[PDB]
Design a protein around this nucleic acid. Sequence first.
DNA 1: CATCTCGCGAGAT
DNA 2: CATCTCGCGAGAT
Lengths: 120, 118, 120, 121
Amino acid sequence: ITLNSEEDYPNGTWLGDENNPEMRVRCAIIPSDMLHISTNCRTAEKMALTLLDYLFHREVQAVSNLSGQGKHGKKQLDPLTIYGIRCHLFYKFGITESDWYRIKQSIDSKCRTAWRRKQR
Amino acid sequence: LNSEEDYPNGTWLGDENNPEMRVRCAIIPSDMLHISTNCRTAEKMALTLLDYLFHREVQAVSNLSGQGKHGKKQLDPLTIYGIRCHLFYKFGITESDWYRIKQSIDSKCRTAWRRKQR
Amino acid sequence: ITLNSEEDYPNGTWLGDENNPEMRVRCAIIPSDMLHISTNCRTAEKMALTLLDYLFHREVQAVSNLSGQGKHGKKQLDPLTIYGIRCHLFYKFGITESDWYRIKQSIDSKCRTAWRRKQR
Amino acid sequence: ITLNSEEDYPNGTWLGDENNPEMRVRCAIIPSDMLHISTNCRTAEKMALTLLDYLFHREVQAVSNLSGQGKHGKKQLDPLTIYGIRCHLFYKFGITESDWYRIKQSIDSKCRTAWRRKQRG
DNA sequence: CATCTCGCGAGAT
DNA sequence: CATCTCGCGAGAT
């Protein structure tokens, strides 16, 4: 996978630290949405699920998960943006490998519920 | 975050001597001094700052998040950031306080929604 | 903005209640002019616009509005004076927040009349 | 009741400050159970919901809330017991009245889900 | 499932 | 009225 550049969402925001091209991804979140996100998410857990709601439509979340495998045709949550969220969580919160694993189980859990309600 | 030129003759929410905790706003200085004089608590200043910053028609269709059963719009996050910056810089409120103040703001918009349905 | 003191208009008058310094502005209106105003304006609406004609020249009213923003180079009507006008209407009439809103539209509407005719 | 006596549950346990007769309530939690609570509940928020389950059966929780006032004809969780929970969480975590307030919505929300299962089974 | 926390209408100050 | 704060159902974690 390849990183991107500002020209990919000129009206967007950087996930990660803008200073480190090795660990930064541009995304479509406009700055005011990010102001709100960075204001109301006091843990890496809650900002990871919130960034997700802001980057993956729940139509997509219902048919997707991290690995793109599993029953019922699970597609794969776009990897450039998943790299973005990890870049951001480590930038803002300094998460560990232990942490990222839990955040990955909750990302998948959230997509599981999005699928759960296209069922009902 | 905005610059002063966004409202040449407006006012600053928050600390003017902190470019990260200040939001230029359209409140005229006349009115701001009145807000600083006759709003002696964070809770009242929040609800009256709200009315100087958002028409009651925006308030009716809006809540703090944009989520909700009602297809609601979201109160401009730059302005809400300034409300918050200002309440910190004058009353020095905690985030617990800020949390409970924030429920009052949803509550106000929610009664605005009620009136708009009458 | 900063309140003034009596020494700013010794032959002037006080807008507001003279007893708390935090809600009184000294203005240049002579007391005789003030006697005519209080006897002749039986509403805050009417007194605000009459007060305005006594503190802002029509020259100035035509160029200005309350925001100092808008089209055609609006200048901001002096805030200390505006603070005084509202200090006065709450002293004499007890106006509410809703009331102050319409009166601000009146003041601005009246500034529009002064500008429309400056170039008729 | 009024701040009960230890004879009310001779072989039970104390909620709160044992050497403070106004901030202690005697309850029927057996001592092995209380030890388990003291060991495995590491926060006031979990201790409250866990204590709830040891002092009120599910069927009581279903038709109860903290105040007794509700759109439904609810009953009130025995205020003496709720006092003890409160005394306890403060005795062993030094919780704020702000905390107690938020913890008390958690209690009310738990009984609310107990209501939900009773009508789903 | 247990628990947290939300948006909500409407009763209380 | 304007504002506080409640009980609630249910989504989020």
